[PDB]
Amino acid sequence: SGAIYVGNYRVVNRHLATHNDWANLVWEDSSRDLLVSSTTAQGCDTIARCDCQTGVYYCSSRRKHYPVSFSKPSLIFVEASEYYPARYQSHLMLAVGHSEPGDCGGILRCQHGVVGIVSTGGNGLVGFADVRDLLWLDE
């Protein structure tokens, strides 16, 4: 679990969005596994605006932050799970690292700020849903 809190927005994995997030929906995209809902309070996370390919992510299944190298956002085949059938997920970045289903929501950060959140993984990989292209998160 986990979310990014920037301005009056809350960014979560779409598959983990609550019925309360859908009522307060701003934008969602099933192909990216993202949902953004509006908040009453102002958030303080800064979104990165960069092309960094190294960063640090939080892994809740190890209670540890790990440094990683990750691929640029791309269209990647993601195996079936209880939340989606087997499909291509867009704007996804992969790294070699540990992840379990419940690690979704953990933040990936670089020197510039938040890059994205854990969204996919298994078999020694971890995938992150990029948020750096969502320029409107800053307004």
Ligand X SMILES: COc1ccncc1CC(=O)N1CC[C@H](C(N)=O)C1
Instruction: Say if residue 110 carries a ligand binding annotation.
Output: yes
37 in contact with ligand X (CB under 6 A): no
Q: By CB under 6 A, is residue 2 in contact with ligand X?
A: no
* Contacts of Zn ion in 82-121 (CB under 5 A): 110, 112
Which residue from 74, 78, 90, 83 is spatially nearest to 32, judged by alpha carbons?
90
Amino acid at residue number 15 = H
Cα 24 to Cα 11, 27, 39, 43, 122: the distances in Å are 12, 10, 8, 16, 31
Among the residue ranges 2-10, 17-25, 49-57, 71-79, the one whose residues contact Zn ion (CB under 5 A): 49-57
Catalytic site includes residue 19: no
Is residue 50 a known part of a binding site? Answer: yes
Distance of CA 131 to the CA centre of its chain: 7
**Is 15 among the catalytic positions?**
yes
Question: What sign does the dihedral 66-67-72-77 (CA atoms) show?
Answer: negative
103 carries an active-site annotation: no
Catalytic residues, by residue number, are 15, 33, 104
What is the binding site for ligand X (CB under 6 A)?
Answer: 15, 33, 78, 81, 83-84, 89, 99-101, 103-104, 118-122
